[PDB]
Structure formats: structure tokens, C-alpha cells
């Protein structure tokens, strides 16, 4: 596996030239206004990913900025929910053409109730991710070597999932349902950013 | 106040020329597979209302559905989750343009946990619902006197509250907010038809 | 109101020459094995009671136990899963021709959640049962007017809450239902009285 | 072991000439409605079986309904709640004459309070079943071997199961309390699927 | 109603030369170790009481001791686990000879789950205490006429109590049953100074 | 009773040449990050009360910010966890000299459970206080006289609570536990505003 | 090991003329009057041990009883509630003179919250009890070596742990605790059999 | 490893002559009044540990407590909520210096939610901590080699912690909010010991 590790930004664009991009994100914990951005994963699918270091305080990253927005690239996250909320947080752009693997996974693996990305993994592909490093300090001026590997074990599988994944929605016909949520995604991220991340807006209490 | 009581549909669309009009259901329960729709109520916001008994098995209404399709007009309910995810199961229609009360009361009325309709009415217009009738026998051939001035009160101040919640929306800056919500609010109805009503399908569990 | 107070037994059984009996208990508490049956009120549904006040230790009661044997005659309870089993624990004869009101308003009245006997009262027939006397000492050996006038009120209204509901199992065509429950409740009283009483032998756990 | 796996429907009854079948059913989930029926096993209980994929949208399967509907077999399920739902559900069918493991365990295994599948296979006749394939996609066009094997292994056992625990029963005097819970069985998976899945009907609250 | 107040002790026992007293405490709270006792109060069943302020630090009280003491007198008191630990830790003597009006209720008053002293009361005696003035500052130098009304009547009746429970326990058969918990109760309330307060000593977990 | 009310900020300070100061708050929630300052009530314990106005934006008022920060003048709040953090996060101004009313009467109305400031001027003072207009429009352009009403009597009692909480604390000798509370309250408000606010940051979990 | 099985009774008392005799049962389930008595397991501390099988319907054990009635020998059991609610209930004797583990590990193991034998066994002996056996089929008319391995297993320690015990009560002098404990504890296990197993009688709710 | 038992007290101060001492109690349970201390471990961080047994009703150590009374030294804890309440507690010396390295996790190990000590340890140094040894026997009179082991343990790797927790401290500047939780923890034991260890003091209900 080739893993590129950098410092503040992508040095250009020319890997990237695609139709659908695997984000993640490691922070310093759940509560963007409290916790940083520490590291940004990437991944075209061709089974190589891009980590990118960010930097206390850093407001700006061009070129990332610049995929994060290009509407004619989906965006692939498990979870989106937290990282767009990060990263609209640090960067100060919403991305808003996602898809998500849990929502995907709560739409159509109704005959379980474990929807982590693991479980998702070895169920759908027998690829057994390791998440000892989960919880580890992504703050470090210099990753580990076993950090460096999982963070990139994050992005590398999320395409051939996203391929299943609509295959199975096209199965039960639920692409309409699917594309909805996708769509209603981001701003469920801005009312999180917001304040209301605790709350199910549409609940009855 | 002046109550026009029908059998089955609208005579015809006369009265309801207008940009937004006020929409409640009763229903035999809370679970739309099981509990049928009974009656539906609407109201131009000029005082008066119409209020409709639905007849068992009836698959059509073609005045009211007219109305609940001409996306020129928006329907405005409280807590419409319920209502869109009824009316859609009984007639086959899915509204898209939707304002709904509870959603705007969560994203306005932040400084309180009650946002049931009573509390708002009483809130907002000093106003008195008295709701000793919404646990009641809804699938009577004739309602009672006091049942058809209950379901009346449900959309008599809807306009009123749509204003001031309007009002507000705008004066904490959560319009785009709000709009992306009640654009998502059909799908979350289609979701509980369709069998996820216990399920927040965006909640990590 | 005429309520008839007796000692042990009913006299004979002239005056229950009829279709249906209404019939309720009174106990030192919700557990047969610990908790005597203390009173049994009857009614043939013209608006007069009969209360029988039971002695401690007493095995037998000849023409009360005709009664409840006699397959022609359906009995009529409200929740009658504890008055079956504390029936059958004292006199050794379980009924199997019963109508209970709260299986047939859990089957009925969906639009509630309150399916107590005196929110049923106050809602179908609009009259208001008192049940300050439920908790007090039945087995006082001369009971007060105000327990027999309660006591008394438990079964004066049966009989229209059983035809009401016949009506409502038609209307929403469970009857069916209603039936196969109605057969199975001596059985769920057995099981209650063999130990299963806080266990719900149908579910998954 | 010897497993056929068919497509749609059993070619005849010739292996299933005999008093009791087991039966068990693998589905997309939990709920009838949403989740659709994927496979139906079957064994004779000569240490063969029969898996049958049932396709989507499919209505009929005269074959298997007939052996659903003989009156002179005995039908044994384990957990049968879900699974008369799911096939009446599916072909319209309900059978009437059932025995349930669950409800039989229940009854006889009271020094424990674990019931399911594996710890009653293991507890009773020393065999391990692995119910890793449990939560995998039913609704494959072409099953894995694994899927084959563990659909098998869930009514291979079912049989000896009966033995014992008719056994028991009839040593612990439960039989007629097993034959009340058996004929109710059906009208309880009927209740499930008209909406009251979540509701105890025999229950105070 | 005659009530007697003293300063520290009683003048002498004049007026307790009889076979039970009824005693009560107050206190700032319910740690003995951190509230301290403030007011004892006790009755002859004569239909007057003696209300005793004790003093901050206080370590003596001579009269009351050997009142206390005295194993020819029954103590009665209302939930006495607490007062038998408060009077102990505060003077260094463990009443030996004691009734208990909750225990003696939950073993005859099994009809209710209400086995506070106003139901009980209430109930037995249909007397209306009112607990207005039982969270108030007890440690007060002078105590206000409405605390000591209040403290008087929660002795006046134990008397009564006793004799009625009495003839329940006797009635129903548990004489020996009280018994062993009330020879029970001091130590009970010894566990609860040594540290054991929120233990239940008998429980499996 | 006088109601001084000012818009944006105080005239002058020469009505709080004083040792103690009264201060409250109002917002809009119970969320500093998103719940805006609305109104600030500040009372010299002279029946009069000022009622203070702020802006939506507003980011200095600099003669009460002036007060806020004097270090020879005790604030008194009532629950001053959360009014210390809104002053904080409004103004950017943390109190270091403070008073709380509801830390006070955990550490001495130890002999209740109910610690509200209604209670509180229940009981030491015989005051009733309406907490009808608590859930208002605080933000309204004109505060309605209820609401002004409302809005003052929430200061005009703090200073006879501290001086009988002083007793009080004198008497049971918690003086330095109560210093140490009152030291450290501006720090826990302080962890309240970066994000630990649902924290209990000494808790072994 | 030496392990006699006996059928109904020991055939004499001449192993069992000792100061001391460790005691447990083995029943269907938790509630005697449901699960029968089906094993009772003895031992005199020598490194062995009797296991008596106790048929179904047995009323008597003429030289067992002689052994649990006889006030000489105290009678060690582990969690005696359960032991002393059965033996009373299927033989009508209710031993006076006991000593139970569990209520001495609750008073002395104060460092820990697990209280089970197989932890007290493994802590204070580092002896390892395997307890796959205890939830087995314990009527079945032969036992199983791995079953009457286990029975024996469960008395062949409890004198050690009773000399363990002993020590710990006398080093953190509370003798006289755990000596009023076991003398109520007779008590508490006929209140088991009465009727209230799952109440605390000496808990305020 | 060396260490270092002794009874009583330390010989002498001269190997803590330093700025600042790792500081860890054993004792019979959670509860300060009713639980002795029996161990207190010390380390200078020179990979030694001192290991004194405290005896049975010792009110006095004065060389260890010289060393916790130095506002010189910086005693450092693992959930020092506790150890200084019990310190206090037996010796009558509340250290008012010191660093607790629970608080620190909470305010820098922001990406978990496990702050125990072996986790800790596990993730910063990759130093496993066997735990067993916890729930024991601490008050044997000759404790084992696995004891003394476990115990010195707990020392050894504060010093190493505290470097690190104050360089995550400085990085995300946090460092006067643990300055004034540090500051404050000695009240906050003191709490403890006065009866409010179950009360969060500054939450508001």
C-alpha cells in the first residue's frame, strides 16, 4: 500500500482528477468547538491514500478546499454527519455532494443492528480493520507509523462499499429515499455545528 | 367561528384561492398501517374551517388532493411528519411544499421543552385549546358537537403561528435552516411508511 | 340502585337466569397466593348488584360456582387475567366463556393509551366512577356503604361497555381476534396462578 | 448431510409424507412489512433438508403451502411468532397446528434464562451451532456454502428437540398449558402483523 | 391538644410510668453522621405530647435515656430504621423493644403500595396530617408554633396505629413474622450507622 | 417597588456604591454558544431593581462590565454556574468575587431535595414567587410589563438570602467549605464555556 | 474425592456427628413454589461429600431433617435465603442455627462488589469452581459424573471459608452483626416463602 | 525493581528530598468512615517504590506526614478525590499541593472515554498494569510478593504521566483551568468526608 503523508495542504490536484473522492477525518474528540482537526484522509480508490497533517490554528487549505467543493465530485464518508460538521468547521466550506456508508447501511443492512465501519468491512468485503488506534493522540507532530496505517485503512475501502452499497439500494428501490438524506446531510451537519447536536429535530420529543 | 362540515370531499376549490393553507388530520392512532384516517381539517386563515369525515376505505378525494398537490400552495401543519406520512398512505399523494409548526417552535422556541400545540397557542396568542377531545372515538358516522369545535381549533390559528414563527426564523438568521428541514420533512414521513418511524436515521445509534 | 349484600352464597339463582353476568373480585392484593379473595359483586345488567362477602378459609360456594361453571352464560370482567385466577384458586373452577373490557378496548380503543375502567367509563358512557375505596380493607368483617356503593359500581356497567365494544370489534372487523384472546385468557389466569405471572411467555425475551 | 437447495418452490411432497416438519425461515429483518421472506428450510427430520430461495415480489408456492396448510402435520418452529408471521405474511397461509421450541423451553427450562437456538442445541444435545451467518445477505441471488450449511442446521435439530421436550412436559404435568400456548401461537403472530408486535395484550400496562 | 415543650430533657417520668411511648425524631437530614439530631418528641397516648429541643452537641439527655432504655416500654415509631439511628448515634444507647408502623403496614396494608405515614393516617383513622412543615429549618432556636403543632401530631396517633395493626397481625396470622422484624429492626439500623445505609444486606446483588 | 429600565448599559454607577450587588440574568437558553444574552437585572438591595436591556451583537457595556469586574463588590446570583458563563461569554468579563444562592443551600437546607429559588423564597421568607414568564420571548424589542415584573423579583431577594445563608453556614460551621465553592465557581464556569459542560469533572465516571 | 449418592435419605447419621455441616440444594429454578427441590449436598468438612437425590412429590427425610431441625449443629450455607426457602417448604422444617457465606463476605469483603461463591472461592482459597453445571437438568432421574462433580463442588469448601470468615468478623469486630444477621435470616426466608421475595421490608420504598 | 517494605512509618526523609513525590493508598473498600487505610505506596520516581503498612487504629505516621504537609513537594495521585480523603481522614493532615492525573486525562485525553489508570498507562507508555490484585485482602498482616508488586506498581509511572500531562496541558493551553481544578480538589475530598460524596455540588439538580 502507498500512503503520501503532507504537511498543511495536497501539493496539486493531479491525483484527483475523479468522479467520486473517500474523505475522513481524526479529530481530538466528538465536539468540533471544543476538539481540532488533527489529520485528513484521502483516497481516489486505486488503492494508495493521501494523509494530510493539519496544523493548530490553520484556517486555510487551498487545494483541499477546493475538491471539498467541486460539486461534480462526490464526497464518501462513513459518518458524514461528524466530518462535515469538522471540516465546514475549520475550513468554513460544507461540501454538499455526499454519501454516507452508515445511512446506506441503516437503509439496507436492515437485518443487523451493528452499522460501525468495521462490522461493515468484514461483513461486506472479509477485510478485518484494526481499530486499536482509534483512540490515540492525533495531535503528535509526528504520527506513528501504526497511525499512519490506520488512518489510511479508513479511506481505502469506502468505493467498492459505495459500489455495493447502491447496488443494494437499486435492489430494494430505495435511491429516492437514499438520495434525500444524502441531500438533507449537510445541513443535519450545520444544525450539529449549530447547536443541536443533541437534538432529533424531527422527533416528537 | 363558521365550521363547514362535509361528507367524503370539497365541494369545489372556491374558498381556497389562496397562498398557504392550514392542514390537520384525526386518525383511529398513531401507526398509519394500522389506524385509518378519519377526518381532515383545513382552514384559508380567514376564521372559518372545513372539516372533512373521511369514509372507511375510501381511497379518493379528488377536491382535497388537488389542493394537496398544487405545489403554488404551502401546507402548513403541526408536527406534519404524522399527517404528510397519513394523508400520503390514505390517498396516494406526497405534499412537497410543507411549513411545520413543531419544527420551527424547536429551531425558535429554544428556551423551553414543551412545544406541544397547546403550549404554543397559549404562549404565543394567549389562546386556550382545550384538548380533552383528541383521545375520542374519531370513526363515529356523526361527530359530537364538541369533537368538530376541538378538531376545528387545531387549524384556526395556524396562519397566525406561521407568521410569528416566520418573524422569528428571520430574526435569529435560521431561515435556510428551516427550509432545508421542512424540504426534508416529506422523506422523513416516506421513511415511516415505509417502516423506520422508531429509527433516527441519521443517529450514530 | 338496589344492591343485595349476602353472607357466603347467593341464595339461588333466580335472578341470574340470563345471557352474560357481569362479575368482578375484590382481594387483600394483587397476589392469589398471598392475597384472599375477600368480596365477588354480580350483576345481571338491570341495573341492581349483588355483593357476596367471602370468609376467610372458605372452599365451597355451591350456587356462585354453578354460575361461573355454566358454559351458556358468558362471563364479563375488566382485566379478568387476575379475577380468573384468584376465582380459580379459591373455588378450583376456571371459567372459559369470558369477554374482558381490556382486551377488547386495547383492541379498540388505539387511539389511547389509558385503558383503565374509569377513563373507559368516563370516555363511553360519560359517568364517573370513584376509586378512593379500591385500596382499603375488604376483609373488614362489616364492610361500609361507601365500599358496597363502590364495590357495587364495578359491574353496573359492563354490560353496555360489552355491547359498545361488540359493536367497535364489528365495526374495525377484529372480532376474530377478540374471540381467540377471549379463549386464551383462562390459560394466561393458569399460567399466572402456576408462577408465570411476570413473565410474558410469548416474547423473545 | 445431505441439503437441496430448490428454487421457488418444493417439486413435490414426496419426502414429506410424514407427521411433523420442521420449519424455520430466514428473512431481511425483523419486520414483516418492510422485510421481505429470502429462504425457507425444511427438514423431515432423517438428518436431510431442504432449502428453498424464494424470489422477490414471488406470491405462491403451492407445494410448500400445501404442507403448510395439512391440518395433520405438525409444524414445529423455534420462535414460531415471527415465522407464522412472515409466512402468512408472504403466501396468505397461516398454519394451525404448530409446536414452538421458545414457548416450550419457557415452560421447562425455568433454571435458566437463556432460550435461544444455541444455548438449547447446546445444553440439550451437546451440539455447537454457529450463528455467525445469522446476520448476513439473505437475499442473494446465489447463496455461499456457509449460508447453505448454517440455513440447514436450524431445523436439522428441531425434531429432536420436540422429542425432549414432550418429554418434559409430560414429566413436569405442562401439557395442556402447552397445547393452550401452541393453539394461541397463531393468533399472536397475526397480532404482530396487524400492529400490535410491540404491545402485550394480556398486560395491565 | 396539650403540648409540652422542654429545653434538653424532660423535668422527670411522671407522665411516662406506662407500657409503650410513642417516639419521633426530626433532624436536618437524613446522614445521620452529617444531620444532626434537633427535636424528639414523644406521646403517652393520653392525647398530649412532649416536644424536647436538643441542642447542638449535645451528648446527654438522662430522663430520655433511661426512657430509652427501659425494656419493659415499647418504643413506637413510624419507619424507626432512621429513628433508632439518629437516637443511637446521638446519645450511645440502641432501643431493644420496638414497633414499627411501616413495617407492620407493608405486612398488613398489602393493598397499597402507599405505606407513607399521611396515607396511613388517612386510611386508618381518616385524620389529615398535614407534612407541610417536615422540610423546615428543625435547628431553629425557637421553634414556631406551626413545627410544633406539626411535631406533636406525628406521635399522637401511633397509639392508635399500633392497637389496629395489632389486630390485623393477629387477624391475618404474622404475629411471629413482626416479631422477628422488629427484634430485627435495631440491628438494622446499627448496619446502617456502620456504613451499610444503602444495602440490602439479604439481596442476591 | 421601583423598576429602573435602561437600554444597553447603566447611566452611571452611583446607585451601586455598595458592598454586594445583586445580579441575574435572562437568555435565550440554557446554551451560552448559541442562546444569546437578552436581559440583566441588578438590584443594590434596596427594593428597587434595574433591568437592562442588551442588543442582539452587543459586545460592551462598560459601566456594568465596570461592576462585573470590581473586586471589592460581591455578585450575588442564584445558580451563578450559568450567569457567570453567559457574562463571560457576552462581555469577556469573569467575575472573581461571588455569592451563590443555590451552592449555598445545598450545603445547608440539607434537610430537603428541592433547591430552586422558588422554593428557597418559599421557606426562608414566605415570598411567592410566579415563574409563569421564566419561558418568555426575552429577546422581544418591548419586554411586557409582567415580563419587567418577572425579570425583578428575581434580584430583589438575594441579599436577605445571603444574609440568612451566612447564618446559616456560621451556624453549622461551613464558612470555608463555602469560600472554596465560591473560588472555584468562575473556573467551573469557565469549563462550562469550553466544553465540558455536561461534565461532572471530579466524578471517578 | 469420595462422593456418596443416595436415593430419598441417608441411610444413618454415624458421618455426621460433627459441630458443623456445610449445606446446599440444587432445585428447577428461583421460586419454591414452582421448582422443586431435586438435590441436596452435604459434607461434614472431611474432603467429602453426600448427594442425595429428592424425588418428585418426596414429603420426607427423616434423618436429614433430624440433621437440619437439630439446634447443636450449625448448618453453613452460601446465600442460605434461597437453601433455608426450599428445605422449609419441601420438608416443613425451618433450620434456626445457621451461618451463611454470602452475608459474611458482604460484611468482610468490603473491598470488592462481586460476591459470588465461584469469586470467594477463587480469592480466598485460589481454588477454581466451574459452574457450566449449574444451569443443567437436575430432575433427570440419573445424574450425570460432571453434574454430581459440580454438586459436590459447591460443599467441599464451605468449612474454610466459615474458618476465613470468622477470623475476618473477629478482626473487624462485627460478630455481633453477623451473629443478629444469621438469626434473622430463618425469618427472611420464610418471608421469601409468604410472599414478598422481591421486597425489601425494611427499605423506606 | 527495588522496594522497600516497612511498618508504620518511613525511617527517615532521606530519599524524598525532592520536588515532587507519587502518593497511592490501599484500603478496605470506598467508604472513608467505615474502610481503614492499610497501604500508602511512595516513589520518588527513581524507579523505587516505599511500601508502609499502616497498622490497624494508627492515628500517626510523622515522617509521611511531614512529607504530604510540605507545600514544597507536589504530591501526585491517580484520583486523588479519594486517597487525600482518606489521608485526611486517618492522619488529620489534608495536603493542599497536588496533581492528579485522572483530572488531567479528563482535560487533555479528549478522544476517549476511559480514563482508569491501566488504560492510561497502556496508551501514553505501553506499560501494562495488572489489575488482579486490586480487590484483596489489604489488611493481611504479611502481605504477598503479588501484593507488594501490585502496589509498588501503582506508583512507579506518575512521575512519567505528569510529564507528559503537563506538556499536553501546555500544547492545547489548558493550564490554568487544571490549575484550579488542582487547586480545589483538597475541598472537594474535604466534601467528601463531611457527607456530600454522592452530591455533584455544582450541578444544578
Known sequence: TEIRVHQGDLPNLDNYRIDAV??????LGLQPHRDRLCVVQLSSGDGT???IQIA?????????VRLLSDRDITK???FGRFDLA????????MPDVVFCT???????????????LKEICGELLNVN???????????????????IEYAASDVLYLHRLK??????????ERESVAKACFQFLPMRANLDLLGWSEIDIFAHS
Open 22 to 27: 473517500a474523505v475522513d477525518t481524526e479529530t
Open 49 to 51: 491514500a493521501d494523509v
Open 56 to 64: 493548530k490554528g490553520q484556517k486555510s487549505a487551498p487545494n483541499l
Open 76 to 78: 464518501i464518508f462513513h
Open 86 to 93: 469538522i471540516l465546514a468547521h475549520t475550513f468554513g466550506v
Open 102 to 116: 452508515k445511512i446506506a447501511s441503516k437503509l439496507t443492512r436492515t437485518y443487523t443492528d451493528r452499522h460501525g
Open 129 to 147: 480493520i484494526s481499530k486499536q488506534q482509534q483512540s490515540s493522540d492525533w495531535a503528535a507532530e509526528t504520527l506513528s507509523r501504526a497511525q
Open 163 to 172: 459500489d455495493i452499497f447502491e447496488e443494494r439500494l437499486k435492489r430494494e
